[PDB]
Write a protein that binds this DNA or RNA. Structure first.
Lengths: 44, 87, 50, 111, 121
RNA sequence: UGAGUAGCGAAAGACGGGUGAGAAUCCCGUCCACCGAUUGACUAAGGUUUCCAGAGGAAGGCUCGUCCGCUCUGGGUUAGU
RNA sequence: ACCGAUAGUGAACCAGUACCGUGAGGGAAAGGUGAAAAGCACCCCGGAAGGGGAGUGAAAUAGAACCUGAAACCGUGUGCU
């Protein structure tokens, strides 16, 4: 049986990366909500 | 300049192939062209070739505080003339 | 099939009446002086010598 | 006069140890070492090391001869258990208990 | 047969032959009580073929004994078959049956099995 | 509580000699058995020190353990192609 | 005429941290030895662990799993039956 999560370094950085969220206006609001809460890592 | 940080003395690369090669520690933002010229400026020797490698951080203190060890950059030089780069 | 009711301390202690073990059935060897099993060798200094 | 010796944090489960302590209870000090040495339970070498040290206290600290020592009291108490998990089918998980007991041997001289 | 000893047909014949060739090179081995009663008959029948000495007896004994190099002779790589028909057969030339003796030791640790010692008388 | 009950996850092991408080389970030797368009030899992704040596046996290993992909202390990745 | 560790902020604690999800996101548990470490020198059994004495202290059944120590529950003796 084949599972639903196959790891990938490039696909994880090209969709949820820091530069990916800093290119859109709605993604810029995601980094702000995590700074307000105080998370350790912002984009991953 | 002070490119070299510390000398390394171990079982490998020291007391074995150490009479003709020397193992040093440098900063993590230097290339072997500077490492070659910096050795000749401190010890007045002539270097044949330089080999440099990198090391990733390694975990430590398995238990309460689980942190990471600093990364390092190891260099190995070979001299054609001269010796005694350490004592 | 699941138990319909809880188990008492009385019913639990009555069932374990015969849940015991017996004495190993040992004798004395008149060569090593120590206790030992029957039809076997003295585990200390000595032998069977039957 | 008495002499005690306690073993704490013994990994063996308690009710597995009580089956052997019901054999040396009331016997002599010589008849009990043999009963424990010629049996093949898991807690056999553990109870013997506790009964042996209880006789070493009766001769060093207290002053009495071990020629007529009898086992006066033997019992096992509970201890802090260890909680573990065993994965089962369909994602369920069961609990596993790594229990612990406290062993106690009391010798006397009957006087 | 007599008792299955918890194995299958082909595995039982490979184990009984392993113990018989071990009682010839060392003359004393430690085993289990149930397996000691079975190898007791395997070795006592091989000594009977050694007292005959015929070529038909040497070939009827090559079906059981494994090919091992006993150094009991201490020279020339003597085989498990060459020790038989020789010093073993000379020791029991007058004895009529009963060339095996088993002694009991006690239940072992972690198994509760009866350890025994079987040796040539 | 059910209960000292179900289970302990496809499979061939035997003996002698060592180590040690303690060995069916660790080490060495011999015999036997299994795979062999693969249970063998190289590599990409992925994992991220699990690699090596000397020490340790509380917890983890579905038993044991002197052993370990576990614990502790030092080490180990060299390119003009 | 507010709370006193299941309370009071999710967080008295090295917490938005273990941890759980591809991700946006969701989220705990864990305070108290003594006035002062004065944290049990030495002896005995044991491979260790843990104990029995002797000492420290006003108190060690105050020995770091350390103030008081309830119930469920698991035990060891005995007076009647």
């Amino acid at each position: 049986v084949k599972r639903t999560y196959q790891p990938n370094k490039r696909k994880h950085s090209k969709v949820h990366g820091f530069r990916k969220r800093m290119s859109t206006k709605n993604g810029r609001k995601v980094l702000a909500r995590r700074r307000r809460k105080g998370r350790k890592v912002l984009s991953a | 300049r002070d490119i070299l940080k510390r000398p390394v003395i171990t079982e490998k690369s020291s007391e074995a192939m150490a009479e003709d090669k020397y193992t040093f520690d440098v900063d993590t933002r230097v290339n072997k062209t500077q490492v070659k010229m910096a050795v000749e400026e401190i010890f007045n020797v002539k270097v044949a070739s330089v080999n440099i490698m990198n090391y990733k951080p390694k975990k430590k203190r398995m238990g309460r505080y689980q942190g990471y060890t600093n990364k390092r950059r190891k260099a190995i030089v070979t001299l054609k003339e001269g010796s005694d780069d350490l004592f | 099939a699941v138990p319909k009711r809880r188990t008492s301390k009385t019913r639990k202690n009555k069932r374990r009446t015969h849940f015991k073990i017996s004495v190993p059935g040992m004798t004395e060897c008149p060569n090593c002086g120590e206790y030992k099993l029957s039809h076997r060798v003295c585990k200390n200094c000595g032998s069977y010598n039957g | 006069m008495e002499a005690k010796a306690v073993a704490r944090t013994i990994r063996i489960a308690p009710r597995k140890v009580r089956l052997v302590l019901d054999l040396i209870r009331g016997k002599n000090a010589a008849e009990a070492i043999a009963i424990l040495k010629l049996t093949n339970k898991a807690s056999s070498p553990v109870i013997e090391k506790v009964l042996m040290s209880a006789l070493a206290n009766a001769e060093h600290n207290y002053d009495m001869n071990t020629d007529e020592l009898v086992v006066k009291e033997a019992y096992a108490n509970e201890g802090p258990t260890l909680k573990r998990f065993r994965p089962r089918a369909q994602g369920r998980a069961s609990a596993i208990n790594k229990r612990t007991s406290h062993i106690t041997i009391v010798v006397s001289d009957a006087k | 047969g007599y008792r299955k000893l918890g194995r299958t047909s082909d595995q039982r014949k490979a184990m009984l032959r392993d113990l018989a060739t071990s009682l010839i090179i060392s003359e004393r081995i430690e085993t289990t009580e149930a397996r000691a009663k079975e190898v007791r008959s395997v070795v006592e029948k091989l000594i009977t073929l050694g007292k005959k000495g015929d070529l038909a007896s040497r070939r009827n004994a090559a079906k059981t004994l494994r090919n091992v190099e006993i150094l009991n002779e201490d020279e020339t790589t003597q085989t498990a078959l060459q020790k038989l028909f020789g010093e073993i057969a000379e020791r029991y030339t007058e004895r009529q049956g009963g060339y095996t003796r088993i002694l009991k030791q006690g239940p072992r640790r972690g198994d509760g099995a009866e350890s025994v010692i079987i040796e040539l008388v």
